[PDB]
Design a protein around this ligand. Structure first.
Ligand SMILES: Cc1cn([C@H]2C[C@H](O)[C@@H](CO[P@](O)(=S)N3C[C@@H](CO)O[C@@H](n4ccc(=O)[nH]c4=O)C3)O2)c(=O)[nH]c1=O
Lengths: 122, 121
């Protein structure tokens, strides 16, 4: 029902803000990343969908899993990293919000060829 | 530094596949407006494999007089980006034109791949 592309959007897109200390707490919950467990690490990207989708035609790089279908953004993008705290205990998942400007690396698949996985920021 | 092959892909490859704002968005996203507005740039809308294949097509002289240039046997989907007359950095402005033309690239290295966009014809 939920496509890989849609799941990527749900997990990783937040175009609506350009960059709150309680951002991650709220967003990890609202995007259903704390439902079955506390997802430990997750990145949100504050750019347009078109800008993130465009990365699939940018710098081809090796994926961390050894596949070859990963792409690094030529420009830095505004991102927020969410990382689970040490004192976090499901179901009260708690996170540190870290904002950065970094290049992103995504895995792309499909026709159309679109992001399905967030591999890293550099 | 960036390899020549990689620079070619950044500057000239867009296998994604069109707004009149396409060039404005692309020349920015590929870092072609950073210090200056690059005045003229062509993007190719074919697979990387198709463009790399041009290195085994029609051998021609390059505009610099070297003879490692190759013309595509087929026409390809391209977008020509050319700065407007009134464009002034840092607000770089481009006219986008879609076309279907043969491309000419310089090839080098191992693997033997495009390292320079010479012309569309
Ligand atoms: C590194 C990183 C990851 N993530 C998200 C994307 C994914 O939803 C999730 C896990 O991605 P990875 O860390 S690339 N991921 C892939 C996973 C199989 O699904 O396998 C994991 N793995 C692999 C080897 C290993 O030793 N340990 C481990 O946990 C790592 O975390 C994210 O949003 N931002 C990031 O910066």
């Amino acid at each position: 029902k939920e496509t890989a592309a849609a799941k990527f959007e749900r997990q990783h897109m937040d175009s609506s803000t350009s960059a709150s200390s309680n951002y991650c707490n709220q967003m990890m919950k609202s995007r259903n990343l704390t439902k079955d467990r506390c997802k430990p690490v997750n990145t949100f990207v504050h750019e347009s969908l078109a800008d993130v989708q465009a990365v699939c035609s940018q710098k081809n790089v090796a994926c961390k899993n050894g596949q070859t279908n990963c792409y690094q953004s030529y420009s830095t993008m505004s991102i927020t990293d969410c990382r689970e705290t040490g004192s976090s205990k499901y179901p009260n998942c708690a996170y540190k919000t870290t904002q950065a400007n970094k290049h992103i690396i995504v895995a792309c698949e499909g026709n159309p060829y679109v992001p399905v996985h967030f591999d890293a920021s550099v």
